[model samples]
Target chain A: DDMERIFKRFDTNGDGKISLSELTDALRTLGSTSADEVQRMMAEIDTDGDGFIDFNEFISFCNANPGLMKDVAKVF
Target chain B: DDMERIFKRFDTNGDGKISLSELTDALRTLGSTSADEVQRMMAEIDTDGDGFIDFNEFISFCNANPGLMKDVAKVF
Candidate 1:
C-alpha cells in the first residue's frame, strides 16, 4: 500500500480526514498512551488547526520527521 | 509498508526527493511505457517545478486524487 491507502487506514471512519481521537487511536496501536504526545503531534501537523488532520497535513508531518514514520509505519 | 516507507522505496537514490527519472521508473514498474504521461504527472505533482518531487509533493498528488492511488499503490 502507498500513502493514500495507508491514510485511508489511519482515517478509519472513511471521512478522508483524521480527528484527534483517530490520531490517538493510531498511536495507541503502537502502545502510545500519552495523550500529550498526540496533542503535540497535532500541533505540529495540523497546520489549519481545523480540528482534524488532512492527508496533506499527514504526509507533511512524516516528510519533515521521518523518525515519526517508524511509529506511523508500524500501523502498516 | 506505509507512505514514508514507500517514499523511501520510490526514491531509489536516497535523496529524499524524487526526480523526473525516478517518477518515470516508478511508473515503468507498473508497465507504463508512455513518457508523456510521466511529464503530465510531474507537471501536476511538482508544486515547485524544481525538476523533482518532494515527499510532500508526492503525497499531495495522491491525497487529492485517490484514483491515482490505484496506480501508485501498485509499487508496494
Candidate 2:
C-alpha cells in the first residue's frame, strides 16, 4: 500500500487526521519503536508538519522520489 | 491490499490522481459495465473531485460501510 492508505490505517481514532503521538503509536505496531525513529521518519515525510502527513504532502514526497515504494518506508 | 495500492495500479500515468476514463476503465475490467453505473460508482467514491479517488476518500467509503468486506452485493 502507498502512504495514504498506511496513514488511514493508523489514523484509527478516525478524526480524519493524525498527531505525533498517533503516528508514533501506529509506527510502533509496525516495529519501528522509539519516538526518535518516528520523529526522524516523520520529518522525512511530513512537509507542513501540522502534526499530520496529509495526501498532498505524501504524493509530493512519493513523486519526487522514484523507487520509494521499494524502501522500508512502505511498511504497510 | 489498500485503496492506495488499487488506485495506484490503475492510475497508469501516476500523475498523483485519476481521471474518469481511468476509473471507468478499471471498473469495467470487473465485468461488462454501462456508463451510468460507472458514473454513479465514481460519484459515490471520488469525493474531492480531484479527478481521482484519493486515499482519504476511499478510506471514508470503506469506513462508512459496516459490512463491505462481507457484502454479497459487492465483489472483490
Candidate 3:
C-alpha cells in the first residue's frame, strides 16, 4: 500500500475529517491532478460528499480501485 | 486481494465473463455459504450479468463496498 493508503495521512485537516481539498491534495501528491482527474481516480470510491471527503470515503475510494492500488503496490 | 484477485481466473470460462455459477464456485472455494448468500452477493455484483461477470461490474462492486474493502485490507 502507498503511504497515502493510510487514512490518517490523507485526513489532512485532522478535524478527524477530510475535505475535498484534503482528498484531492493527497491524490495529487500521490500522482493525480485537477478535480476531474481526482474524480476519475476516485470515481469508484467517493460514495458520499456533504462536500467533504472523510477517512471512510478514502478507504472506499481505494477499495473500489484495485487497479490503482495494484499500481501503487508496484511502486512500493 | 484474496483468492478472488484474478479476473480471468474468476471468469472461469474463456468467455471473458463470469457467470453466477462461476462466482458461486469461487466463493465456495473461499468458504462462503450457498443459495441466499450467493444470490445476494451475485445480485449486488452482477449488474448486468447475462449470467456472467464483467470487469466494470467487478470494479463497481469493489468501489461501492468500502466497508468490506476496509475489512479485507485490514486483514492484509
Candidate No. with top DockQ: 1
Q: Which stretches of candidate 3 lie over 4 Å from their true place?
A: A1-76, B1-32
lDDT by residue for model 1 (A32-56), tens: 2234433443444457776444556
Best by lDDT: 1
DockQ of 2: 0.03
lDDT of 2 by residue, B19-51 (tens): 444444443342343334334454445566544
Off by over 4 Å in 2: A1-30, A70-76, B1-3, B6-76
lDDT of 3 by residue, B1-76 (tens): 5323444554665564444455344333433233333344444444675443344554454465554345333322
Model 1 per-residue lDDT tens digits across residues B18-64: 54444444433423223343344344445777654455665665565
* DockQ of candidate 1 compared with the true complex: 0.04
DockQ of each: 0.04, 0.03, 0.03
Q: By lDDT, rank the candidates, best first.
A: 1, 2, 3
- Ranked by lDDT, the better of candidates 2 and 3 is 2
* Deviation from native of the Cα of residue B65 in model 3, angstroms: 2.2
Q: List the residue pairs that clash in candidate 2.
A: none
Write the residue-wise lDDT of candidate 2 on A1-76 in tens digits: 4345554664667666544344334433434233443344455555676544455764665565422332212322
